[PDB]
Amino acid sequence: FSPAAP
Amino acid sequence: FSPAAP
Amino acid sequence: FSPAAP
Amino acid sequence: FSPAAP
Amino acid sequence: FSPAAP
Amino acid sequence: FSPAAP
Amino acid sequence: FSPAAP
Amino acid sequence: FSPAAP
Amino acid sequence: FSPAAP
Amino acid sequence: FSPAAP
Amino acid sequence: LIPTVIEQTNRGERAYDIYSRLLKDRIIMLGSAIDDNVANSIVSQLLFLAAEDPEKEISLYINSPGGSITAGMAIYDTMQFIKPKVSTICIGMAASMGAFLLAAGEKGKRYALPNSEVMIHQPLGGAQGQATEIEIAAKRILLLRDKLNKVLAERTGQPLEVIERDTDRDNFKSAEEALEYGLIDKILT
Amino acid sequence: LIPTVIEQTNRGERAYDIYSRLLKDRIIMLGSAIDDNVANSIVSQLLFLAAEDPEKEISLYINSPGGSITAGMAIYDTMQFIKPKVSTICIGMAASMGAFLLAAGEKGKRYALPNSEVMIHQPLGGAQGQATEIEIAAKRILLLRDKLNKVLAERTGQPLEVIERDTDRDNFKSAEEALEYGLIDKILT
Amino acid sequence: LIPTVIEQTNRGERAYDIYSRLLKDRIIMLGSAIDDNVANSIVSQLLFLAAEDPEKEISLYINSPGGSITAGMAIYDTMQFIKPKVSTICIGMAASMGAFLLAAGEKGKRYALPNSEVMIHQPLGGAQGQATEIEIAAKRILLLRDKLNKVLAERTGQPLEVIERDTDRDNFKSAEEALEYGLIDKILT
Amino acid sequence: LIPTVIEQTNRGERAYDIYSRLLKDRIIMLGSAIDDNVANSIVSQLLFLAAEDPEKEISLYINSPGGSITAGMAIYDTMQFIKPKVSTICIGMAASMGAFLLAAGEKGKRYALPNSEVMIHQPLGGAQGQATEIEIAAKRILLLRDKLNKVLAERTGQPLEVIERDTDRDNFKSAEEALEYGLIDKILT
Amino acid sequence: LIPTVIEQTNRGERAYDIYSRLLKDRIIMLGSAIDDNVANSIVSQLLFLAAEDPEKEISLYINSPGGSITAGMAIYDTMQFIKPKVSTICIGMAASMGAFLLAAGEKGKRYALPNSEVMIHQPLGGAQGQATEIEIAAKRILLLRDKLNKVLAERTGQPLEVIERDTDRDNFKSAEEALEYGLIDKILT
Amino acid sequence: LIPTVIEQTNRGERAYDIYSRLLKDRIIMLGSAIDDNVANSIVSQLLFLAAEDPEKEISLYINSPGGSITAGMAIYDTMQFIKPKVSTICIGMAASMGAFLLAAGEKGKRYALPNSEVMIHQPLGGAQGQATEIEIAAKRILLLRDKLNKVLAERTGQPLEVIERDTDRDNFKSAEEALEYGLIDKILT
Amino acid sequence: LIPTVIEQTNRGERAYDIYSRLLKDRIIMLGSAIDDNVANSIVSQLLFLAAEDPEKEISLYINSPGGSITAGMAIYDTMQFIKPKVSTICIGMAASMGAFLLAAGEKGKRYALPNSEVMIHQPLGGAQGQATEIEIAAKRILLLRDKLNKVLAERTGQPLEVIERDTDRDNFKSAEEALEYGLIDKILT
Amino acid sequence: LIPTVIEQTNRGERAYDIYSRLLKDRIIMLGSAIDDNVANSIVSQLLFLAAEDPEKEISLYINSPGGSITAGMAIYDTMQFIKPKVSTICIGMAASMGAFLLAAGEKGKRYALPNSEVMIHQPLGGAQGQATEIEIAAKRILLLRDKLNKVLAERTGQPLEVIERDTDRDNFKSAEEALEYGLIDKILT
Amino acid sequence: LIPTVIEQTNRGERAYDIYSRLLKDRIIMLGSAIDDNVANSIVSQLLFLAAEDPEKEISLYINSPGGSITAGMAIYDTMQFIKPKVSTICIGMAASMGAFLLAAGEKGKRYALPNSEVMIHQPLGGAQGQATEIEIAAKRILLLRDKLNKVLAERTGQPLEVIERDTDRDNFKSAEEALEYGLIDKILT
Amino acid sequence: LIPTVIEQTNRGERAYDIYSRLLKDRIIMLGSAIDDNVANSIVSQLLFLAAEDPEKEISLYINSPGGSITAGMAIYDTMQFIKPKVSTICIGMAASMGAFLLAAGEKGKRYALPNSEVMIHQPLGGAQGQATEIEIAAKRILLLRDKLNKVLAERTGQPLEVIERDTDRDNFKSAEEALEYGLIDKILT
């Protein structure tokens, strides 16, 4: 789950 | 059961 | 059971 | 339980 | 059972 | 069990 | 299951 | 768990 | 178990 | 467990 | 929940159960699977009845899905020892050993209702252990097999080689086929 | 469901069960597996009967698939202590210990019906623990084995080396073979 | 199925069970494993009997495979409190605690039948928890072990170091070996 | 199988059980584990006895392996409400709560047999749920713990800090050590 | 094993059980968990007693670990319908619904023994199904919760917002704290 | 017993299972009851696929008899977070929560086979404890009930008061009725 | 049935499972009930990851219905010992102890999806034995209760007397109410 | 947990289990109860070994508590069909059928360790049904009994009337008594 | 489901499990209840590690709810035989025997995390049989009790009469109280 | 979960389990209850090791709670047949048969750790059937009892009448008492 976790 | 047993 | 027991 | 109930 | 108990 | 209870 | 899913 | 075990 | 089986 | 078993 | 009954001879108001009011009229019921506890009661009823009046008829009123072998012979012999005459009636069903007793009644007194059933088959059994404990059980059960078929031949009338062949299996019969086979003498109407 | 009965001596209308009406005629029934609860009742019946009239015969009417060892000897000794004479009758079956009592009757009074069975075999047992607890049980059971076969030899008549060999196993017998072996004296007709 | 009996003193027709007809003749039976429910009945029978006639003999008629420890002492003390004299008889078997009572009878009245058995062994037990709850149970059971062997030594006659050694195990005995060991005084014939 | 008894006051032939013949002599037995069904019967026996003759002694005859806490206090209070005097006797055993009643008798009437046992220990319990349901149970059980030890101190005589320390565990006692601890007053011979 | 009793009015020798001898003195016991079978008997005892003499006091003698909700109100209404006055006494314990009846007695007659316990808590329940079957049960149980707390407020004296807060949980009480809370009026000595 | 397959890109002889050969073609299967272990795998498949090529279609291929509520929303949110477009196909069956995902596909890509079934019903549940623990569960489940019906109204097109009424029960639907209700867009031929 | 994946760095054709392909991207999953076997694996994953590159972010990806207390603190301390920074994300559910870890992330990195749930309640427990073994457990569990609420107050921001009152029960929360309570910092879109 | 082994012929590093490293040296183990699944593997090992080199010795290494009858003869015939010579060794135990194979080895090659045991007994069995299904089983088992004792007589040397008498029972033997009975030829040192 | 890891020394792509990658860094985990199967593996890990480099530190990483007594000493002696130095760390919990090993580390290397727990109590046990088999078990368990408390006194520093008194029960401790009691030397931050 | 290990001789990267890396150093473990499946593996390990190098020492590393009798002698004889020398070491425990092997090592090589235990007791058993099947088992078990005590006398040094008396029971021993009894030769430090 990126941007931002990764 | 009579006549005849009794 | 007689004669003879009784 | 008397006196007083009976 | 007598003689002797009774 | 008497004497003495009864 | 294509055409069209794939 | 180092420093210091290792 | 040899000598002699093998 | 050596010296001496091995 | 079997009801009670009231009876008045001279004094009056003596209350019985319903199964003990029939035994006062020389009737015995047999409505369960034959075990050793049931037979010890029937054996004691017959002897009590044959002590007050030794010349008076008795009835048996069978309806049973069979049971043991020893207990049935314990009754077949007691029926032949006593002085009075016994008569047998089928009600609904007469299985493995009930049919050995229905045929054991007095010649001329063996009745049955129009819609009944009669079954005859060879004994069951069981065995377990080692080879020497099986050769013994298999030798006992065959002597029983050959003992019953020697009684049925003289009670019914048929020869023996027909009884050895007919059973072999479960063989059901009605009340009209049995009147020809020889198990009974009359049908009630 | 064992019925009731009505009896009238002088006053009349006294109601018994059917097993207590026989005990008024000096009869005892034995129709179960021998345990410790059954034997304490038989031991108490014999002593009650031997107190009213100490010179009157008693009967025992055996039909049992055996049981314990101690309880059977508890009856074999009580039969020999009392003054009156006891007589024994086989009905259907007489297994392990019932046959030790059927032969224990009075010489000349040991009857049996024509189609009966008699079985005799050596004791069973069990043991468990460590090597010192087994050497004890295996020493007790053999003394029992040698105690019963010393009684049967004098009751029947046969020598001892025949009783040690004959049993060894389950050995069934009819009512005619036993009359020769020596277990009984007469057959009823 | 224990029968009933009829008895006629002056009026007549009073019907007892068979175990309550003996208690009218000062007899007590003990034919079960000793628990707390059985002992509360025996303790209440002895006190009832010792109230009508305080100078008349009583009997106990033992046949039991043992049981608890507390309940047995509850009877051993009640037998010594009362005024009358108690006599004991073995019938078939006398296990763990029945043998502690058979020896507790009056000196000169301790009978037994010719073919009986007598067993004596040390107590059993059980324990569980933590190291401080086991040191307590193992301290209680040894005091019981040392309490019973101090009674048997004075009842029989033997020294104490012989009783500590003889038991150790299951030790069976007949009726003739016990007459020498000291547990009994006479054999019935 | 607890026997029956016959009693004859003026008319005669009235038949009791053996536990109801003692209650006619102002005796109560307690031979089971204390539950709520047993206590409701004892509470009803005491009140019935204290209505015919309000000045006559009563006995209790304890032998029990303990039980509940509430039911025991339900009896400890009823013994103190009534007018007559109660006396207590140990027979074999007196466990957790039986010993709280044996000490609750009248000063000068608390007997015991020579070979008996007396045990005292702190309560057991149980709890489950969430952190707020445990803080409540653990607060109730300690108040009970501090309630019983305040009664024993005044009944026996010992200070309180000795009772808090002595129990802590299972602590068995004989009939001679208890005579010094203060639980009883005399021993029977 | 609850004993029997003998009573002699004019003729004499009429034998009751011990629970039916109290009901002759206008006493009712309640010593079990409240179900529907127990309440139908209590409801029938009250109406029988209020028919012979409609102006005479009654007692209830509670000791119960609670039970149903409907059965308790079935008694709370019957106590208010009849003409006589009812009095309540706690013995040992008074749990969930026993405490709703102990407070329902007549103002001035609500007793208790010195060492007793009183507990009050809100109802339990259960529900299962789909979302529409739960919204109904959760609506019924709250109406019961608000029905009982409106009765306790007027019986005791306390306001309502105190009863909603005090219970919330299991809340135990002694016999002296309840005398201040308002559940009872006197303590027996 | 699901077979293996061999595939040869450039080097050749790389052996897959059959479910991992489809995932190389951007396909995900869902053929079980939805639990927490199954959803953590699907959530990890979608994120892996959306990392190599963030602009490429994905498929889901539903056939399930429903399951939990939380796990289904854990997938409904992950499908909306990522960049690519997801398409849904029914195969045989689409029960409680499979139908909440079949409608959650992209507008214009929601297919189904001609002989399929679609079911929609309101949540189930359960509750137990005391009156305060039920008012909470019954408040949570209704918020879920009102959360799902606010999503279906905007996905399908129908107003809300129709969705509250239509379900209420088990409501089955074919592939042609759903094309009018609004759950899907096309049927395959 | 969790699939396999193929990956090609330089040489190519290295086949992983799907859970080990994420750990190569510094991701840890937690999708089960917390026991002692699960925590020993998570504790060993964190230390392995913090050895290659000690300055690189880590993620945790929670979805769990809670579990033990000790194992959760075993992770809460390991997260604070190491040098790198950890970030937490809720997926579907975050029960008893998952919510103690979701708040334990780094200030500014605590995410959650729009439709999620967060629950907080006080510990459960159990106890059994005697009165001295319960006073200990009830003293331990309260120290845990007071230890966790001292951490939540500083992580969230709220005072302590609010945390003691708010929980008391099961208290569910959405993703928008928690953003105000203080458990998280942002919501993903 | 049976270990692995590494072996290096020319190339090296080929890893076997420990039971397959012996089969490369022409050894077969038999360490289980003989069923039908075990015999089909032994029958397939012998034929594989007798195909590479048809003139090379084989060993069998028995230790078994017996089993079926058919499976043992399935091996006794395969040992006699093939060309090579088989040799047998006892290790610990050789029960019912293991002893029928230990004697079936080649004359001059039948070894045993100094502290071993050898048992021989007659077959067990079972039967159930009706009188015609038992006469068949009891006829089959005796033919097996007479088939095995005709093989042992020629293998050992003893006459037949000695084998019929000796077994009859469980008969244990050591390694020195068997050397005289004829079951083996030598003892290892 | 414990993941795999890839490692590249010189050649690269060697795949371990995660528990065998730590053992390459001289770490041993202990995360289960101590039985005999677990100890035989730990004993074999220590000896393998002390053969490559006999002068290099080792770690143990305890988290266990205790277990047997023999297996713990089997490790306490192996730690003292070898040449290298061992260091111990608590993670979450250290129960009955884990705390006997945590104190057995090298003086100056015994660490613990800030929120941990340490428990010490006396052994449990069990016994059953007769009076002579209990006096033996109760003599063995006390020697173990006196053996462990002689080791703890010299490891910690406290006198012996304090260790006999302190345990007696379950006694929980934190990481700061133990630093004063003497079980550990430092706390990690 | 027993780990793996990597080993590099010349080529490198050969991966063993941890129990097969010791067997490459001529070590055998025995850490289970002795059955027939375990002994067939140990018997096959010894023969494999004695084929590569017939002059090299072997070790056995015992820790076992005993087991069968036959399987232990199957190992005691194989240890004496082979050419190399075997040495034995106790680790934690050495029960019923492990102590028969610990003493069977070579004179001068029998070690033990300082805190170990050694137990010796006489065999257990079981028997059931009829009186002739018990006299056989009770004759076999005593020959085993007299066979083991003739080996221990020559291995240790003590006379035989001391071994018959010492065991009789469970007899525990430490590592210093056994050095005097004669079971071992040295203690490790």
Side-chain angles (χ1 to χ4, degrees), chain G, chain P residues 27 59 61 89 91 111:
Chain G
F1 291 100
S2 305
Chain P
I27 288 159
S59 306
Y61 284 31
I89 305 169
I91 283 153
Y111 304 105

Side-chain angles (χ1 to χ4, degrees), chain L residues 29-178:
Chain L
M29 295 290 286
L30 172 50
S32 188
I34 293 157
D35 306 51
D36 316 15
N37 286 350
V38 171
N40 299 328
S41 67
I42 292 151
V43 169
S44 67
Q45 286 184 47
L46 290 145
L47 305 163
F48 164 74
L49 292 167
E52 294 90 55
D53 211 318
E55 49 275 11
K56 282 185 79 67
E57 205 197 339
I58 301 175
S59 306
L60 195 67
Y61 284 31
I62 295 144
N63 177 17
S64 78
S68 291
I69 298 284
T70 49
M73 311 308 273
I75 306 165
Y76 172 81
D77 49 55
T78 302
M79 286 145 75
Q80 302 290 328
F81 181 82
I82 64 184
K83 214 192 283 278
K85 306 196 167 95
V86 186
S87 47
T88 64
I89 305 169
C90 188
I91 282 153
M93 208 74 209
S96 80
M97 298 300 290
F100 190 72
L101 314 179
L102 164 59
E106 195 72 13
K107 190 81 188 292
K109 298 154 174 61
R110 292 175 297 181
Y111 304 105
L113 299 161
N115 49 3
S116 304
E117 267 186 348
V118 186
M119 194 268 282
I120 47 174
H121 73 112
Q122 65 177 359
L124 309 160
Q128 180 162 343
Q130 62 186 6
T132 310
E133 299 172 33
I134 292 161
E135 199 189 12
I136 288 161
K139 210 180 269 184
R140 188 209 173 191
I141 211 170
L142 304 168
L143 296 174
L144 302 178
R145 195 270 307 282
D146 303 25
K147 201 198 288 171
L148 316 182
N149 305 347
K150 184 63 66 57
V151 168
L152 281 176
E154 73 183 13
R155 294 281 170 181
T156 70
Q158 294 281 12
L160 179 51
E161 56 263 23
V162 173
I163 314 299
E164 299 179 359
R165 175 162 60 230
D166 284 344
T167 76
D168 208 57
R169 283 307 179 180
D170 292 276
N171 189 17
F172 300 93
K173 269 157 156 46
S174 65
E176 214 288 331
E177 307 297 338

